[PDB]
Structure formats: C-alpha cells, structure tokens
Design a protein around this nucleic acid. Sequence first.
RNA 1: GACGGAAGGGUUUGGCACCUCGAUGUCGGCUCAUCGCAUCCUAGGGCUGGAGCAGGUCCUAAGGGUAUGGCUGUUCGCCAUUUAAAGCGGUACGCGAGCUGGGUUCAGAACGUCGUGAGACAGUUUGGUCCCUAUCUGCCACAAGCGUUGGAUAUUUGAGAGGAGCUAUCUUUAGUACGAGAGGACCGAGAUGGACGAACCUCUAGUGUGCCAGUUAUCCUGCCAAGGGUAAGUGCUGGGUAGCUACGUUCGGAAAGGAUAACCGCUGAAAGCAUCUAAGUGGGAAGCCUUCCUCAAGAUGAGAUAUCCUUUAAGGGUCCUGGAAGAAUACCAGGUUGAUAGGUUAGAAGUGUAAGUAUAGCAAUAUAUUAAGCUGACUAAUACUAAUUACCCGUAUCUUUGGCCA
RNA 2: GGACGCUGUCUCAACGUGGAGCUCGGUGAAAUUGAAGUAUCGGUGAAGAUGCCGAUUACUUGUGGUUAGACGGAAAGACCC
RNA 3: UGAAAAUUCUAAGGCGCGCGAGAGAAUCCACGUUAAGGAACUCUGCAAAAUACGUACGUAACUUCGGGAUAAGUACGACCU
Lengths: 59, 121, 122, 46, 117, 48, 206
Amino acid sequence: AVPKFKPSKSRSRTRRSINMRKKIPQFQECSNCGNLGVRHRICLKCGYYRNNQYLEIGL
Amino acid sequence: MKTKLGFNRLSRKSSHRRALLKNMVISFFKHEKISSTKTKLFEVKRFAERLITRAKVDTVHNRRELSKFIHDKHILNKLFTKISPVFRQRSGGYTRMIKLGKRYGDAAEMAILELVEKPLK
Amino acid sequence: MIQMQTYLTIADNTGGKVAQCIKVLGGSKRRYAKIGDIITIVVKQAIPNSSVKKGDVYKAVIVRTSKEVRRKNGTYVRFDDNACVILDANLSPRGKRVFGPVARELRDANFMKVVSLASEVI
Amino acid sequence: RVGSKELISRWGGKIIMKSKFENGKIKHYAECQTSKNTARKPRDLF
Amino acid sequence: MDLIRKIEAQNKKNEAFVFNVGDTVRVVYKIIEGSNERLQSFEGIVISFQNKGIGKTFLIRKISSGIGVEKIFPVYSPIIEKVEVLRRGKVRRAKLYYMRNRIGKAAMKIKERLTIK
Amino acid sequence: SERKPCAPLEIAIKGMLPKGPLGRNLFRNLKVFSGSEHTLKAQNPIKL
Amino acid sequence: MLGLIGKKVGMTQIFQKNGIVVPVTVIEFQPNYIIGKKTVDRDGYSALIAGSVDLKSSKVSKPIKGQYKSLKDIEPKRYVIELKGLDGYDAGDEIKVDVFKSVKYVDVTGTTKGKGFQGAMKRHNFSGGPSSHGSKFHRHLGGTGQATTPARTFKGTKMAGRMAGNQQTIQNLEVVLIDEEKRALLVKGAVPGAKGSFVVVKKSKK
RNA sequence: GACGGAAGGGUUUGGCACCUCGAUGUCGGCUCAUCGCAUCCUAGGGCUGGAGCAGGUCCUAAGGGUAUGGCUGUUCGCCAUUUAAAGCGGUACGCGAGCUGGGUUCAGAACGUCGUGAGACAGUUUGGUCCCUAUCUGCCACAAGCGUUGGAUAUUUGAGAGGAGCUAUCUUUAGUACGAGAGGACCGAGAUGGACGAACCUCUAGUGUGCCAGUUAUCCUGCCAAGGGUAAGUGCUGGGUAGCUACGUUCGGAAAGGAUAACCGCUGAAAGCAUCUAAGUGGGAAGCCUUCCUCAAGAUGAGAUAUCCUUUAAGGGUCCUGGAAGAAUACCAGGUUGAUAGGUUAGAAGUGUAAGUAUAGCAAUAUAUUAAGCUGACUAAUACUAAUUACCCGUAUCUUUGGCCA
RNA sequence: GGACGCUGUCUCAACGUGGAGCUCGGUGAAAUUGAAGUAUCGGUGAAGAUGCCGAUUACUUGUGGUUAGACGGAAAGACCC
RNA sequence: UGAAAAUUCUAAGGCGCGCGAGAGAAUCCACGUUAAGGAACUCUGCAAAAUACGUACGUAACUUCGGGAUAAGUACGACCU
Ligand SMILES: [Zn+2]
C-alpha cells in the first residue's frame, strides 16, 4: 500500500497534466451591455438576462 | 440504481428536508424574490406552485389545510388574499427560476426564484 | 415450502401428532418441498400407546402448506399450518382417516386415496 | 394417472417414427401419416 | 389512452361482480379434473382487493375443521360462475389481515352494516 | 488450410522473418494469394 | 428471416377459454418499410434493409436524407436493421404484422435493462461472508487467484463492474395472439428491455 | 494372478541444510476458483465361469456434474438420510495487505508426572489485540487523444474471443425378447422434475423514512375545535402505487453436418493362406471443428457498402432542459421549427369516509352530508414556466504504374 | 450439555435509512521511494524472474474498482542456534 | 408524566459541534423491515430478537428452614358515565 519505486518524472507529469485540467465555460455576449457572459446565466455586469432585470448590481 | 424519483433529498434527512422546504417557501412568499442554490430553489418551486394552485379557491377547509404547511399566519393570509387572485387564470407555471452562476468560495450553482406576476399591494 | 427441520402436523389417525422433516426427496441439492411431494420425517410427538413411536423415521406426503403456490387458473391456496400424512412402503397412506382439509394438488400428484379420505379438498 | 398421452401430431396424425439409412449414416427420424412431413424428433411435430 | 388497457377491455368478457371487503360471500366456480369439470363452492369473508387492471384479485378466508384456509381468486377469471353476498359487513381498514391473528369465534366474524329503515 | 487457405504459408514466412519493428515491416511487404491471380497488375511484377 | 421492429409496450395477462391464465408481453408495431437491398454480387451478401418509426424533419442529417432520395413518400426512419437472406419484398414495400400469422414461436432481440456499476454479489450470484460471528467480510469477492503460481490474476476473473445494457435475444417465445387492427403481438413470457424500448421480432429458428 | 524382476509419479513419512532469520505469518473453516487424468457418475467399446437383469475386468474419453446433517479445533475417520454418482491430486499440503482464532505458538490459573528446589513435559483444562487510504505489474469496467491515405454520417460482412455442453422419475415399445420360475430388457420416443443460467415484473412475495389512517406523551398555534414539531438516523402500529428484488413468472441445456479417439469393417498384400492397411475405401462418442448466444475492422491485415460535402462545407463537440442511460463519464431524447423537464388538467390507483354543518345520546360516541377528503414516484394532454436573437473544431498533399475517356 | 419460547445466525438474500466513498470549489498529509519508453507463457539461474533465452500477445494515455505479484510496507524475528 | 433526580417533552437560560456544495455507483461502517422455515449457521443460541411495569391469582424439588422465589405459570390496565 506504499509506492514501491519513485515514479519517473514522465509519469508524474503525465498524470498531473491530465488531471489538473479545467475546462473553459461557454460564453455568449449579453444582448444589453455587450459583455461576454456565461451562456445561460444572468449577466454579472448589467443584471439583464433575455432583456429582463433580475439583479441590482452594486459596488 | 436509483429508485424514489420525485425528490432531490436536498442532502438531508426527511424531517430536516421538510423543515427546509417549509422555511424557504415561507421566505419566498414573504419576499417575492429570493436567491439560493439551484437545487433548493427547484424543489421550492415544485412545492410553491402546488400551494398556490391549492389556494386558488378560498374556503375554511382549504385554509386549514394550507396551515398544515404554512405556519406563519401572516403569510398564509397573504397567500390566500394577495397572491393567488392574480394567478386565478394562469394554467400553471407561476414561478420562474433563473440561473446566476457559480458562487465564489464553494462553487455552488446560485439562482434566483421569483413570481411571474407580482401580487396585490 | 417445507424444508429440513420444519415441524408439521400429522393429519391422520396413525397416532403421531407432530413430525419433523429431515430430508427432501428427489433431487441432489433440492431444498423445498411443496404440496404433493414426499419427504422423510421423524416423529417428535405421538399419542400414547400407539402404533407409531416417537423417534421413528418414515416417509410422508405433504397435504397442507402455509405458503401459497400458483395453480394453472391463477388461484392460490394458502393454509394455516403445515401438515403431512405418513406413508407405508407402497407410497400409500398408512392411516385410515385424514383430519382437516387438504389441497387439491394431491389430485395431480396422484394421491387419489388421500384425497378421498380427506374431509374437504380446496 | 394423468392419462397416457396419445402420441399424436399437431396435424392429427400419429408420429410413427422409423430409421432412414444413408452412406454409413444411420438415422432415426419422425414421421406423420397424415401430412408426410419428415423431421427427426417428435418435439417438432406437436 | 393505452394499448394495454384496450387489449384488457377486449379480453374482459366477464364483468366484475359487486361486493366489498368484509362481506361474507359464497363463490361458485369451475374446476377441471383431467377432462371433467365440477362446480365448487367457497364461503368466507372477503379480506382484500388487489392489483391494477385485469390482474385484479380478491382474497377469501374461512375456517374449516379448525384449520384456517385462504384462497386468492382473479376477479375477471372465466371460471367464476357466481358470487353471492350472504352478509354485508362494516369495516374500517382496507385489508383485514388481523383476522389471521384473531382466534376462536372472533376469528371469523365481522360486525355487519345495518341499513337504515 | 480449409478455413484460411493462405494461413500456413503466411505463418511460416512470419516465423522465418526476423523479429522486431523491421521484421514486422518486412511482413507488411508481403502479399499472399490463394489462387493463381493477383490484383497488383499495376506494378508489372517481375516473375520468378 | 422474417423480422419486424416493434416497441415493448408492457406486460399483462390473458385468460384462455377454459380458465388457464397466460402471462403475455405486448409489442406494438409501427409501420415497417423496406428501405433498400443488399446483394451478394455488389455488397457480398443478400439482405433486406428494414426501417421503422420516423424522425423529426429538423433532425435528419443530409446523408440520412439522401438515403431515401429514390423512395417515394417514405420519410427517414429512426430504427434501421437488416434481415439476412430474405426475399419476396423490394424497396418501397411495407411489412404487415400478419407475417407471423402462421408462426408458433418467435425470437425477440432487445437491449436489456441497465443496472449501473454493480457489485459481484448481484452480478455473479457470489455468496458473501457471514453477517455475524465476528465476520468483517460481507459482500466482497473473497480470494481471487492462487498464491505464487501464477503470480497474476487470470483474464476473465469475475469482479465488480457495470451490469447490463447488452443486447440479448430470447428464444422460442410462444405466440399467443395477433391483432392486426391495433398492430399488436402478444407473446408468452418476458422480453428484454424497458418499457418503450424497441425490440426486433424474428421467426423462431426451431 | 503365489515367490521374484524392471520403472514412473515427487502427494505421505524422511534424507540433505542449497534460497530465506534489518521477519517467506504455521493447522482447519468460510468465500472464490483453476489445472492435470492415474475417470466417482453420465458417453462410446472389447471380453467374461456375460441367460436376461445386475455386475466383474480392460481400452478410449476431463464437456458438465460430483450432497446435506450428528461427533470432533480437527485434515482424516465414523454414523444417519440421500443422489445417476457423493472421484483422486497439483496450485506456498490453492486462497489471512479477503474473512474466521477453534487449535497450534507468549505472559494467568489448575490438574497429572518428573526434579530437593527454582522448573520442565508434541500430558490435560480454561482465559488470552489478527495492523496498513494500492505506486507499478495483473485483472474487472467506462472514457480522452489518435490512426485506418478526401473528410464525415449510417447499415454490416467477419478474423478472433467469451458464455453455453447436467441429470433423474414415470408412462408406452414390453411383462414382449430372454428365462424352469422368479425376475426382467437392448434400441428408439413422449410427458413431468431437480440442480444451474439469463431475461422480466403479468401473477405470488418483500421493501416502500413519498403518502394516508389509528394512537401514547409533551409543547406550540390566544383558546374550544381543528392541526403541527419531538420521542437518534420514521414516536409506536395498521396498509400502500412506482422502482427494485426472488420466495415469482417466462425461456434456454437441442437437432443436424464435417473431420475423428477407443472399437468394428469392406476389398487385399508383403508372407500363394490369413489379415481393418501396406495402395485405396469406410462406420464410429457427453470429445474436436461449424452450428446456438454475446463482443468484435486499434484485425495497423485497420474490411465492404449507401448517402452528403468540395476552403471550413458536410458533420461533430461544448452549453442547457432530461431519460429507457448513468461514479465524473459516454450513449440516447429534446432545445421555440419543441410536449424534453417542471407546473397544470385528467386517468389508472393508495388511504377507506375529511373539514364544516346537522340529528341522536348526560357524555364517550354514532349517523347523514360522503366510493368523501387527501395523496396521485406512473400514464395521456397542455408552451403556463424553463432549453436564447450561440461559441469553438472540421475536406483528393506528393511520386510511380495500369485501365477508361480525350 | 440439554429443553421451551423467540428470532435474517443460517437455506438466501433483497429493500430502505444515516455517516464515508463518487464529482466540483477551498485548505491539504503520511509511511515508502537506486532509478522505470515494468507484457505474458515455457525454460534456465544463489535453486519461486518485470529486466536472461525461445516463443506469444499488445494503438497512446487516464479514471472508478479489486489485491494475484513486486518473496509489499511497518518491527537489525520474539521461535532455533 | 411517574413512586422517584428514571423515560420523553418543554420554560428560563445557553447553543445549532470552525470546510462546504452537488449527485446518491459499487463498496465500508452504524441501523430499520420481511413471505415460508425456526439454530438446519457456527468452536459456542456469539450477536440479535424477545421478555420487562403496576395490581391480583398461583408457586416445586431441595434445604443449614434463612431460602429457593419476581420460581414456573395465568388475568387485567384506554375513554365516558
Ligand atoms: Zn449584461
């Protein structure tokens, strides 16, 4: 239940690069402000979404 | 494999799930608009729309049922007097849940739940 | 669903009143006997001064079970205790009368004489 | 006894069954006199 | 609509009789013995109804020579000749399984409904 | 032979060729036909 | 081999004339058409291509569309299979459910129900350890190999993993009823797949 | 087959002290098997002082199967019921980084024996921690990337591989052949089971911490009435759809063909005979290869084919709503051109008669209102709500030769 | 040791509940470690082979499981001398 | 409530355990439920299950006459008048 021999840097690198990989979220520019917002989410910069106000963005 | 479709169990035992649903529905009726995790809001709307359709018709017996779930008297009266009379006609879909993104910190999926038509003031 | 160690009511006038199943016949790993099967029983309790002593080994046929078994026409018959009848070497009832009802799968299992000596066949 | 089932076809014939021969190969095989249909095992004729 | 239910309606051919749980009834039905049929009878208390659709069944319990007996009948079965309601009773459950534990005279009786004059 | 007419000769040649990547490549360089005709008429193969 | 693309509606039971109950599975047959043919001298073997319930016109790719260019009034079909070594039909034809009217037994092929990542005890009928008498071993594999010989686990040793989801063809299902007006077949017994999954019914081999 | 002789097997008890004492954990049991054939039974034979039946001996054959309990820590052995039969060995006397500690092999105590004693004794009895989150290889499964020589979308031929290969009872042939009689068939069929395997939820049965009723104790809703929480991780009981499961249902273990083991031949030698073999030519089995089922062109040997597209098109992916799919996956369904999900309507159904009011009774309570109320995991509709006026990937390179066209 | 009653201890398991396990976000170890573009079988050999010979198999790289091996790790064997 | 400081609920008062959120595969651990059978499992009725209170009836062999003994076994318990 313990490593038998230290793995090679190739194997460590391979595992690390494959696992520690985060995927980009999709985007779609807001119809109101033109910001690039996450697709299917309320715009975080102007608050609109499909031409409807839902937030009141502060500071 | 999964049986028991119809819930999300909200990650908590049955009594605490029921209490959770009751409190969030109370708050939703009080405030007309709330923000929370998407799963919690989904279950909340499943029950809130049911309560509204049960309260479409105002009678003593119906009120006494709705009290078994709404334990705030003020909000029970509000639900029977100010909210439903604007959804008297609508065949369903009184609420609207819209996603908000991943929250910072623990990356929960936030969302906003609100009424399609605001009630009498 | 009589298996080994099951207690059964002896339903005939040989003298025994309780029997214990000690083998299910006809099959290698066979585990359950149903109505109309033949089992090997030991006698655990008998009427005093009878022709059947406690601690003898005989063959018996099952006449009532407490677990229902499907019939062709969809009907299930579920008695209220498990009961058997002792047989002699010819695979014929050793006794002369049978107490209580029996199930009608004895008809098919070809125990016509048990069926006749029974009181009611259900 | 559940009465001894008369060994009958599905076409109303008895299945008398016989033994063809061909080329070292000895064959036992099923036969109906009503319909003359030849198979091997009376499975196939009920 | 449902094709299953349409096939069931096409295969009923034998309407359900009228009786309720707790009644004491006598059922008369057919039994084959090789090639011959006989009429058999069963008096007892109906102590359950059952499944959805054509698979609906009912359970009858009776006491014979001191031994309890239960039979399960498919409601729409063609073998059922007649069902006749000797005594009609008033219960409060939907399944009367507690009668399996009742013993003696109490093991077989249900207080009947008395229709108002 | 009945199931695969070319199998005996392909197996024998595979055994007699060297082993390793070049041996496998050499076996790639070989075409075996059961009959007396082949499809590589475009190469004008030299008879032997 | 005569075959059809049906949909497993569900199960029920019917009462034979004398009272005997027969448990049946019901299959509903949407119209099946012959879409094309495969020929020994052109494709290497002889078979008939058969298709079934249509697709929505917004979700038919153009390769699929062109597959049906020469056929008249035959929309694209979602379920397409092949019937090997069949004759008596040609492109544009249409197969009734009555082709089974003279058949006593059928074979049904479908995709069995999926059971997810399942353990050994469910997957292979492994017994487990005792639940008392100090046991710390309930539904594990137990031993898997031998000690030093062979110093490995043999290929094909049965362990945990996914259960179900494969095709399977069940044999010699008796044919109980054929109903042309409602396009239904009633076979006696169980048929692989969940409700609404699509099966293929073939004439029995035996 | 007496007295002897020649060998194999490397399992029993041993020899030897070659690997190992900065640790190769020792006997059984449970779970899980695999392999050898020197074959327990089923299969195919030869011969019998083989009448039949039932055997005995011998050859070929490992596809499948080869039991449950009482005693013992027990291997073994014994005993009781069975079964067609309850095989023999290897694999660290299979299997403790899978389980069990009864025994063996610690420190307690007692008994028997020996020793003056301290103590000793494969003599006896009782009590007496079984550690470790898997790095690699190996195996059970699902994906990512990539190739298959234009790029993609579907239908498939098939190398190869896995699963599957069990058996009895009873009734006919036939109480015939055989046999003094008793007794009792070979061969070839039909029907009913056991063990085992898979699918499935129609029935049977379990669960059903969704839901409904009854009810204890306490608190709260101002209170009566009517309800709600808390009695871990349902207060305790009585039922229960869907899903799941077998204790359930259904189906499968064939038949046929090719080459063959043992065996039996035909025609014929060497050897005028004889001979199954030397030239040929054959029959012949739970065995082998096809056949049944599953997977399968990463089979780089990378298949065949029908259609679309021709400088980013065809097509695919991401996102979102979801499933008959499911660990994240992937596949599949659908995305305003839509019933995918939710809501709602209605139904198959569970609970079994609500609240309120009225009648009767001192009250408890009962009756009417009332197949009520309530719950509807499923089914069928319905754009009321949510899947956006969307973002990334993505095609004949070139050389030689043949055929057709020009 | 035996008897009665009672039971999922067992034939025989299935379902449900709660904490982990699974995915994501934040924080973040341990023992071990000569390295490693470490396949298997039949043999040989300090006499049980990931590294040798012959032969066979195998596109590249992960994740979730299970320990057959690496005479696994831990304790300069406690037994013997 | 009760005999009681038991059990449970609750007032005043003090807190909601100093990583969370989605999905619920297998599996680990701690529990709940069960057809037929009821120790056939197993070194061993181990572990569970079950029995349990109050008020009455009725209690052996044996004995140092104290006990055994709550022996065993049996009945009843709500609400209203
Ligand atoms: Zn914006």
